[PDB]
């Protein structure tokens, strides 16, 4: 799948095919747009179909989109969610967001479908609420934590990552520590997940997940996060207006 002009390697990868029986446009996920340098814009791009087993096995392995997470220009990552998934993550990972048991379970199953192979374990496992009484209340950071804990393969420790994001501590109030993203044993405990975590940002959560669990787990995490922030954005939509 190629778009012109092909200025580098990433502008021509090999995608698996999903036959969507609706209309006549090539439908592309949202992470690839950063590498392909296209907008859904009237933009057009070719789709070549290799016709022998060597080319099949060599576009599935050497030219596949998973292997092109980092561009060779400087080693910086090139994939990641782009525009509204970032805002959805900023709103969901803020400590002002609490979810009941039903909302928590629905948000988890909306992206960790075990029938398609999204999660390794055959049973979706959840977390105890952050507020036991008066009534249970989870958190968006708990949503991220259990998403990671479900996609991450078992018999392996979590991600111990310490990073930062672009929103200063003064924006969240006084005495706040939301500028420092902290992962401990695979559980998100501080800071929000803005563009600096998933996207064209170095040493983020997705970059660390890639470097620890291989590129396939990073791709799965990217897809799952994009699906989760999509389902969260329908329930609590993001809007801009004249008052802003």
């Amino acid at each position: 799948m190629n778009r012109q002009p092909t200025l580098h390697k990433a502008s021509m990868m090999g995608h698996k095919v999903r036959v969507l029986p609706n209309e006549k446009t090539l439908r592309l996920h949202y992470a690839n747009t950063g590498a392909y340098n296209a907008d859904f814009d009237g933009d057009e791009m070719n789709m070549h179909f290799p016709q022998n087993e060597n080319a099949r096995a060599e576009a599935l392995n050497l030219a596949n989109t998973d292997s092109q997470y980092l561009t060779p220009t400087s080693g910086s990552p090139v994939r990641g969610l782009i525009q509204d998934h970032i805002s959805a993550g900023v709103w969901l990972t803020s400590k002002d967001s609490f979810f009941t048991r039903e909302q928590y379970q629905q948000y988890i199953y909306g992206c960790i479908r075990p029938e398609d192979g999204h999660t390794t374990r055959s049973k979706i496992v959840t977390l105890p609420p952050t507020i036991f009484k008066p009534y249970p209340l989870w958190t968006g950071k708990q949503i991220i934590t259990t998403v990671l804990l479900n996609v991450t393969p078992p018999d392996m420790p979590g991600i111990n990552l310490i990073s930062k994001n672009k929103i200063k501590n003064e924006y969240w109030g006084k005495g706040s520590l939301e500028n420092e993203v902290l992962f401990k044993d695979g559980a998100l405990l501080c800071g929000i997940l803005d563009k600096s975590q998933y996207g064209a940002s170095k040493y983020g959560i997705v970059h660390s997940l890639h470097e620890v669990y291989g590129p396939e787990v990073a791709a799965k995490v990217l897809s799952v996060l994009g699906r989760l922030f999509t389902n969260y954005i329908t329930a609590t939509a993001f809007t801009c207006g004249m008052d802003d």
Partner: protein, 145 residues
């Protein structure tokens, strides 16, 4: 202290004011002529990097090192054009590049036999490439009698 021209031998006399050991020049040809090929490669890398740095774009030094080494592969300040291209074993690559007529006569006058090594020649003759998955063969272990 920066100047607006290149002449090293003049500042060599002014050792009292100027430390002659750290005289680095923007120009590459003069550096090659007065300091050697390796200094030319170093200044090529530095000049090709400082333009990227000024634009806040990061390019790993392996790419620039490879470019400089390819540019000074004959001990001379070569370039990426037909005037610094004719020194190549494979002719089909140059003919595909440009001036197909001129490079054809220069290859047919001396009966230049080419071994189909560059990707351009292999593409012309329709052979499997030599870079990547084509840099080796594959054999089969047949258990006969």
């Amino acid at each position: 202290l920066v100047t607006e021209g290149v002449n090293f031998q003049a500042m060599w006399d002014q050792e009292a004011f100027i430390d002659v050991d750290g005289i680095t020049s923007n120009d590459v040809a003069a550096v090659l002529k007065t300091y050697g090929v390796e200094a030319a490669r170093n200044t090529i890398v530095n000049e090709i990097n400082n333009v990227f740095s000024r634009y806040a774009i990061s390019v790993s030094f392996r790419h620039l090192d490879l470019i400089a080494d390819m540019m000074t592969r004959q001990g001379t300040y070569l370039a990426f054009n037909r005037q610094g291209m004719e020194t190549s074993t494979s002719s089909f690559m140059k003919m595909s590049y440009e001036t197909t007529c001129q490079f054809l006569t220069k290859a047919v006058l001396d009966n230049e036999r080419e071994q189909l090594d560059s990707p351009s020649a292999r593409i012309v003759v329709g052979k499997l490439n030599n870079v990547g998955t084509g840099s080796f063969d594959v054999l089969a272990k047949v258990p006969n009698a």
